Every structure is written in C-alpha cells, then in structure tokens.
Amino acid sequence: EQLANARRDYEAEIARARQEAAKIVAQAQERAKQQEAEIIAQARREAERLKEEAR
Amino acid sequence: EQLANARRDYEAEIARARQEAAKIVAQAQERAKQQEAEIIAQARREAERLKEEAR
Amino acid sequence: AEYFRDEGRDILLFIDNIFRFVQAGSEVSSLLGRMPSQVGYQPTLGTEMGELQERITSTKRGSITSMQAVYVPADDYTDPAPATVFSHLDATISLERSIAERAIFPAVDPLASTSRILDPNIVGEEHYRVAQEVKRVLQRYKDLKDIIAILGMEELSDEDKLTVQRARKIELFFSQPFTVAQQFTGRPGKYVPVKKTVESFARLLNGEGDHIPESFFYMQGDFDDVLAAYEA
Amino acid sequence: ARMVAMRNATNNAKDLVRDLTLSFNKARQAAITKEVSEIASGAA
Amino acid sequence: VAGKLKGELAQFRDLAAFAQFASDLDATTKAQIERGQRLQELLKQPQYQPLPVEDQVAVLYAATNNYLDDVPVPLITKWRDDFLAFLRTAHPEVRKLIYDNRLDRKFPTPEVKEALEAAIKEFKATSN
C-alpha cells in the first residue's frame, strides 16, 4: 500500500509540475507583453524628449 | 525509486518551464531593443532636419 | 564670563575649537611681520595662550570652569598648537563613535578620559578607590573580546564571564538621562551627585548589581533607581 | 617547523625594522631641512 | 535603509583582519564576510551611470534584507543592473511608489514593503 501511496503521489506531483509550468509560462508571457509595451512607451517618450530639446 | 524519480521529474519540468520562460523574455526583449533603436533613429534624423531648418 | 564671576556666580565657559584661536594667532603674526616659530606658528604662542587660559581660574569669590573643544590637525598631537593647549588642561573627555552608535547617548569613553583631580587627596579615598576598580576591568578595553571572537567564548571562561558581565553592566550604567533631551526621548532627566555616583558604583562592584540582567542598567540615574526598576 | 618559520619571521621582522629605521631617519632629517628652510626664508 | 549598510560595512572592515589570514572561522564569520563583500560589490558603480534615489533605495533594501545572499560576488554588479532594468521595464509603478513616499517617517510601510519584495522575488525566480 505504501507503493500505492507512491504511485498516486508520483502522478499527482507531475500534474502539479505541469500546472505550475503553465502558470510560469503564463507569467512570462504577461511579463513579455508588459516589458515590450513599457520599452515602447519609454522609447517613444525619449524620442519626443529628443525632439523637444532639439527645438 | 518512485520518490527519486518524482523529484527528478518535478525539477526537470520546472527547469524546462523556466528555461523556455527565459527564452520568451529574451526574444521579447530583443524585439523591443531593436524597435527602440528604430524609434530613436527616427527622432534623431528628425532632430537633424529641424537643425537644418534653423540654419 | 568675568563680569558674572566678579558678581560671584559660578560660570561654565565653552570655547569651541581653541585650536582655531591658535591658528588665528598664527595668521595674525604671519601678517604682522613676526618671524615664524616651530611650524610657522607665532613666536608668542605660550604667552598668548597664557593671557587667555589664565583668566579661567577659580578665585575665592567666584569661578569660571571651562569645557573647551580641541581639534588636532590630522592626528598629530606633537603639533605645537595641541601641545600648548594641553599644557593648560586639567581633564580630557573623549567622546567615542562606537559608544554613541550603541545607543548609549553620553558617549564618554571610560578609557582615554583622564583627569588630574582623580587622586585621593582631593576627591577622597573612596572616590579614587571606586574609580580605580572601575576602568580596571575596562583597562583591557575588554581585551577578552578577541578570545571570544576566535574561540566562541570557549564555551566556558570561568571568572572572565563574571568580569565581562560586570564590564558590560558598567558600560550600560554610564548612560544618564538628559534633562535637555527629555522632550525628545520622552524620559525625565536625573541629576546624580558625585556621592551618589561613588556609592552606586561601589555597590555595583561589590556585587549588588548581579542577579539583575542587562537593559535594566541601560538608562537610569542611580543604582537605587535600577533596584526600583528591578523590583517593579 | 613552526620554530623554523618563526625564527625566519623574526629575522625578517628585525631586518624590516632596520630598513624602516633607515628610512625613518632619512625622513627625520628631511623634516628638519624643510623647517630650517622655511624659518630661514621667513626670517629674510 | 543605509544604517544597516553602514553597520555591516564597518563590521566587515573590522573583520577583514581575520578574513585575510584565518580560514578556521565559524560559519557566522564566513557568512558575514560574504555579506560585506556583497555590499562592497554593490557599491562598485560604473561611470556616467547615476542611480536615482528610488533605485538606490530599492537595491539597498534588497541587499540588506538577505535577498542577495545566494548571488555569488562576481555577478552582483550584473545582478544590480538586471534588477534596475527589471524595475525600469517590468514594474515602473514600484519605482514611482518608492519615490513618492520616500519622506515619510517610517519608510518601510507594508504597502511599500509589498510590491517590492514581490518584485525582488519575481526577478530572483525568473533569472538564475
């Protein structure tokens, strides 16, 4: 029965790992979108600042 | 053996998730780094043209 | 200050950076055409110090006690200005950064703070005795700190544990509440006469301070106050 | 081995003191020359 | 934030005498020398790259609160640069929050305390 405890534990732990992996990639995907947008805004704001100081 | 395999598979799945997570942000960032250089370049050329108008 | 001294009232006179007074004298002499003496200092250094420090004295009608501050260029005590200043000193108080940063507000280092009054023929036999028993356990600056550092106290130090406890207790006990800081730290200031100091430290060195943990000698006026805090 | 190492260290320490004392004496004389130059110049 | 910095750096300077020679020091002294080295490598700033007050506060809070202990010494400067890129891109709001309430008597309020330890934890989990 302890082996049976190991069998369900082994299956459940992997299921948690795949579930955690989905959350990890989802967090990375949301970070990737946020970082891309923020860099765009910072670059656009910096570009406008260059124009204003040039003027 | 089941417990050792469970820990090995749990660590491998998480590490695999983190490795691809690092890949996502790496390619997402470099997409922004090349884009921000383009944004700066457009304003830099625009600033030079405005300097010519002053001349 | 001399006006009030002539009025008979005791006066405490503070001179901040008397070394700057020496430096001003040196610059005045250099601009006046006098030849320099020693390291560019004025030839009339001793007399200029005498004409000022000799007015700080206790006559029969009144006294002017002085508590000056001395800045030594670099760390050179051989310099003529600190030497001439020290020739007219009766006591030195060395505030220390480490004691100040250990939350003990009066940072007067128990060591490196000497006085020529600390002899039996003026303060008294008991005062000298108690002031010698203290600063003796600290005479090493608790040199035992190094052996603790490299030995983990060796899990046992016998008497050294008692002497370390007593030294820490005394170091904590040197602190005293400030009546001027009462409105800042929210604690009434206690004025401790010299008799209370000597009696309290005599009892502490005898051992009445034992069986009482630290943080009870941190910020109090008398040993009686420490006992009252302990019983409460 | 410790006795040999300490004896070598003490010999090196004593040699260093002699070297430092030799250097200190040069600095002592140069300090005097500097003072005897400023005071003589300040006299004139 | 900088009081602990100054105290730890001073004690590391004091213990450098043992660090230079002794190799039998306990784990406490070894970890404390390691922390001193962490702080010293943190202070290694390049030229023409000033750090605003919010950035320095964030980095020093991260370092003095043991979030940097597992980072090896040679990579601490790169860690700081990456962390600043993280705050400048991923979480500008934490920088705005730190700079907004840098004058309050008790700066480490749970509000500023959260969303900053969270940012440090996210950065630690994502990289290395």
**What DSSP assignment string belongs to C110-148?**
SSS--BSS-STTTT-HHHHHHHHHTTTSSTTSSTHHHHH
Q: Is B21 on the interface with E (CB under 8 A)?
A: yes
Q: Which residues are CB-contacts of E22 (< 8 A; sequence separation ≥ 6)? A: C150
With residue D2 as reference, give the H or E element that holds it: helix D2-43
* Inter-chain residue contact A31 with E88, CB threshold 8 Å: no
- Tell me the β-bridge partners of C12: C65
Q: Which residues are CB-contacts of C141 (< 8 A; sequence separation ≥ 6)? A: C111
C-alpha distances in Å from residue C43, one per residue of B44, C37, C81, D38, D39: 69, 5, 12, 14, 11
* A39 closest CB neighbour out of E89, E122, E126: E89
Q: For chain E, give percent helix, strand, coil, nearest 5.
A: 70, 0, 30
SS3 category, B38: helix
Q: Which residues are CB-contacts of A42 (< 8 A; sequence separation ≥ 6)? A: B36, E88, E89
The Cα A40–Cα A48 span in angstroms is 12
The Cα C15–Cα C21 span in angstroms is 9
Q: Which residues of E touch C149 (CB under 8 A)?
A: 18
Q: Which residues are CB-contacts of C124 (< 8 A; sequence separation ≥ 6)? A: C198
Question: Taking the CA atoms of chain B, what radius of gyration do you get in angstroms?
Answer: 24
Under 8 Å CB pairs connecting chains C and D tally to 11
Question: C-alpha angle with apex D10: D8 to D16, nearest 5 degrees?
Answer: 105
Q: What is the experimental resolution, given in Å to one decimal place?
A: 2.9
The Cα A40–Cα B37 span in angstroms is 10
The Cα D36–Cα C157 span in angstroms is 57
- Specify the long-range contacts of residues B41-45, CB closer than 8 Å, at least 24 apart: B42/A47, B43/A46, B43/A47, B43/A48, B43/A50, B43/A51, B44/A50
Q: Using what technique was this structure determined?
A: cryo-EM
C-alpha distances in Å from residue C193, one per residue of C196, C221, C222, E15: 5, 10, 9, 41
Q: Are B40 and A43 in contact (CB under 8 A)?
A: yes
Q: Residue A36: closest CA among chain E residues belongs to which residue?
A: E89
Under the phi-then-psi rule, with left for phi > 0, alpha for psi from -120 to 50, and beta for the rest, what region is C141?
left
Q: Which residues are CB-contacts of C57 (< 8 A; sequence separation ≥ 6)? A: C63, C64
Q: Which residues of A touch E126 (CB under 8 A)?
A: 28, 31
Chain centroid to CA E102: how far? 17
Q: How many residues does chain C have?
A: 232
SS3 category, E111: helix
* Inter-chain residue contact E7 with C150, CB threshold 8 Å: no
Quick one: which of D6, A21, E80 has its CA closest to B19?
A21
Question: Taking the CA atoms of chain C, what radius of gyration do you get in angstroms?
Answer: 22
State the pairing for strand pair C11-13/C64-66.
Answer: parallel
Q: Is D40 on the interface with C (CB under 8 A)?
A: no
The Cα C82–Cα C73 span in angstroms is 9
Q: Are C52 and C88 in contact (CB under 8 A)?
A: no
Cβ contact D–C (≥3 pairs, < 8 Å): yes
Q: Which residues are CB-contacts of C111 (< 8 A; sequence separation ≥ 6)? A: C94, C135, C138, C139, C141
SS3 category, A48: helix
The terminus-to-terminus CA distance of chain E in angstroms comes to 26
C-alpha distances in Å from residue C128, one per residue of C124, C133, E47, E90, E91: 6, 9, 59, 68, 66
SS3 category, D33: helix
C-alpha distances in Å from residue C52, one per residue of B23, C59, C115, C169, D4: 79, 16, 21, 41, 61
With residue C66 as reference, give the H or E element that holds it: strand C64-66
Q: Which residue has 């006690």 as its token pair?
A: C65
- Tell me the β-bridge partners of C95: C108
Q: Are A24 and B19 in contact (CB under 8 A)?
A: no
Q: Is D27 on the interface with C (CB under 8 A)?
A: no
C-alpha distances in Å from residue C152, one per residue of C144, C145, E12, E14, E27: 11, 10, 18, 17, 12
